[PDB]
Design a binder for this molecule. Sequence first.
Ligand SMILES: Nc1ncnc2c1ncn2[C@@H]1O[C@H](COP(=O)(O)CP(=O)(O)OP(=O)(O)O)[C@@H](O)[C@H]1O
Ligand SMILES: Nc1ncnc2c1ncn2[C@@H]1O[C@H](COP(=O)(O)CP(=O)(O)OP(=O)(O)O)[C@@H](O)[C@H]1O
Ligand SMILES: CC(C)(CO)[C@@H](O)C(=O)[O-]
Ligand SMILES: [Mg+2]
Ligand SMILES: [Mg+2]
Lengths: 286, 281
Amino acid sequence: IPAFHPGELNVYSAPGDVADVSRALRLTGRRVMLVPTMGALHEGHLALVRAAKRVPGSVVVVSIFVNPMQFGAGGDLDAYPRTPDDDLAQLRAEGVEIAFTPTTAAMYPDGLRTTVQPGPLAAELEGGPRPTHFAGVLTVVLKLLQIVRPDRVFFGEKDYQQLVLIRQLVADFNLDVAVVGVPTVREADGLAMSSRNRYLDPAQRAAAVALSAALTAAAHAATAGAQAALDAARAVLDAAPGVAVDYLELRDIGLGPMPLNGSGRLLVAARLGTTRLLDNIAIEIG
Amino acid sequence: AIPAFHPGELNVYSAPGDVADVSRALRLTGRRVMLVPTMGALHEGHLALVRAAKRVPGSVVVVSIFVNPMQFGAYPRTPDDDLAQLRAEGVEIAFTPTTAAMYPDGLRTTVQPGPLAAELEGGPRPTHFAGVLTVVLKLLQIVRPDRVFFGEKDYQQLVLIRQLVADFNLDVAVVGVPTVREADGLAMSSRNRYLDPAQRAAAVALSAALTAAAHAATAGAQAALDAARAVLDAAPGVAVDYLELRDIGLGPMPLNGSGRLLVAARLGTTRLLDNIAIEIG
Ligand SMILES: Nc1ncnc2c1ncn2[C@@H]1O[C@H](COP(=O)(O)CP(=O)(O)OP(=O)(O)O)[C@@H](O)[C@H]1O
Ligand SMILES: Nc1ncnc2c1ncn2[C@@H]1O[C@H](COP(=O)(O)CP(=O)(O)OP(=O)(O)O)[C@@H](O)[C@H]1O
Ligand SMILES: CC(C)(CO)[C@@H](O)C(=O)[O-]
Ligand SMILES: [Mg+2]
Ligand SMILES: [Mg+2]
């Protein structure tokens, strides 16, 4: 067991160190909670941390690892925001006891060898133009789950397709962990918090409110049916200056091979300049 | 409530959730869970895996019996007899799930093996090892054993499972068990039942070629290869698919040192495989 200081933030980079500490804690009765992140922490991540912290007898592990495998090109990987010092400052302020910060070499000593092949959902929506993105996400999450062996793992609803794919991973591989989805944290005007929001200039920040406005308009319009909901959302997006919609789709909640029937999810992706923003909302039809 | 478990008896569970709960409960009580994955039709080869698991102090042996559709190209079943053999061996847990219980959502998320899966046995069956690693990963997650046992006869399968464990950071020890052989050296295999007399006599060439190579190896890699090739060339009706010397992880064989020699051949409609440790020099 590496040194562990209860009540303080303990940072471990070696997978073996966090694995040993987690096992030891689990053996003494504490329930290990895992919050996987790629760093650049904001209030949305803190909500995941808080959800984890409130589980009785919990010890929280926040992993910070910008996973190369889920980036389609080195350019995107190099562009990903990195603010390590602020991240750890936020974790200490939150009372987090463990941050797991592995190196790329420790996670991929053999490059891409055995990997996770997601189901068909990975080739749609976000996966359409980025066919290997979700295999990258599921492979790293599977590894993080095996290293930490948490009782529960927390993900934000903002990246809803990712959340669904992780539930598929857990069910399909018989993983003994509970997946907890946490509601999206939003700015005062409705904008979904995201590390990519820092790339919106003042005008784009103003126009970006259209995504959340379109989704909530659609959710209330839905009493009149799917067409009314989608058209309300389209009208709001169309009134927004400089917002180029990638997709706007209403799907069954599992996003799978099932038609929309009562409870659904409305998902949107749009570009403001070079920044691609995502958002989604629960929708009840009729 | 945890399902019933009667020590010293053969406890059979078909529900993944059930064997998962019992295994977890037993691990807590001071037992080390050993997993032996099988597809039924048990013979002495499987029994060697079972005995290997039983030897571990404090062991509780879990033998899974599941004909995995995913590893078949897109099979003998003797349930009662298999369970009798396990009972005779002192095995306490048999896990016998249905295809629907293992694949409730069909093939959705699966394991994609590294490039080794496309070589050797992967040539004729390119989706075979994805099927194997997917079901083995699931069995490891359901049973959570301390050690998992596989026969060295399927060496490439053994190596790919070692890759799976390392690559996904699985906390389990993979144990390779030496190949059980008939008196003349033929690796035991359920498929040997298909060989007619002439084919069964010719089939001794695989093991004879490997052992000849292992001993010829003091003279170098080429000598080992040529010796094995000569033995196979002395047998009629043996269509060699491959004869390769690789390092122990199945990469390229080093200048000298340890390695593995693998062979596969077709005798009529039956494909046979075998392999052996080789020390070069
Ligand atoms: N506004 C928000 N509310 C709740 N959870 C959020 C959130 N934004 C992100 N998350 C969650 O935080 C976890 C880590 O995601 P990250 O990609 O590290 C941050 P990000 O805000 O999504 O940056 P990004 O826009 O560059 O992808 C995910 O489970 C994600 O869904
Ligand atoms: N002769 C042998 N010695 C040791 N282990 C063996 C063995 N033959 C098979 N095994 C092991 O038994 C397990 C189950 O493999 P199976 O394919 O189900 C049996 P099989 O005898 O190889 O049948 P087959 O001829 O239909 O391929 C594997 O771990 C395999 O390597
Ligand atoms: C789940 C995750 C931490 C895997 O790297 C990443 O995809 C993210 O930030 O959501
Ligand atoms: Mg994200
Ligand atoms: Mg076999």
